[PDB]
């Protein structure tokens, strides 16, 4: 059973914390764990005017969001990796499970 | 024929088919990534969405 788990979040430091904890857990559980594949991050750029009406110097904002996505690959049966993945999930980090 | 001529006008497409989902106005809509509001409401509620003006 080849299994893929995706660690997609908005904040990056809690993402590094949970990915390091998952890699450490797969290391201590005597399991063949692959390295964390770092996908190219996606920048959310939409610009708008400052003032609500139409007068003033034409000044704009640059609002930004960065979403980071990570990949961890394992070779393990289903129930043990469910038991691993259902431990200590952050509210700002979303995990999703896929099977090949 | 009040029932059949009250709103027989097709608002299938066009600008008035969509509206702001915060304050229901039809000017300056942002449709990108499905926000579906005007610019003022997005600027007022932009912090809880998570958009920061870092750049």
């Amino acid at each position: 059973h080849r299994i893929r788990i995706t660690l997609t979040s908005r904040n990056v430091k809690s993402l590094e914390k949970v990915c390091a904890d998952l890699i450490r857990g797969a290391k201590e559980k005597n399991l063949k764990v692959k390295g964390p594949v770092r996908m190219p991050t996606k920048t959310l750029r939409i610009t708008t005017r400052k003032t609500p009406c139409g007068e003033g110097s034409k000044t704009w904002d640059r609002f930004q969001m960065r979403i980071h996505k990570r990949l961890i690959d394992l070779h393990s049966p289903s129930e043990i990796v469910k038991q691993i993945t259902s431990i200590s999930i952050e509210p700002g980090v979303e995990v999703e499970v896929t099977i090949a | 024929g009040h029932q059949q001529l009250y709103w027989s006008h097709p608002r299938k497409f066009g600008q008035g088919s969509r509206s702001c989902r915060v304050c229901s106005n039809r000017h300056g809509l942002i449709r990108k990534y499905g926000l579906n509001m005007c610019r003022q409401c997005f600027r007022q509620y932009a912090k809880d969405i998570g958009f920061i003006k870092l750049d």
Partner: peptide, 19 residues
């Protein structure tokens, strides 16, 4: 399920749910 919105729209929907 048959909608499957993209990864940007999921975070946009979650933040606007919080708002």
């Amino acid at each position: 399920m048959a909608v499957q919105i993209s990864k940007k729209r999921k975070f946009v929907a979650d933040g606007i749910f919080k708002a």
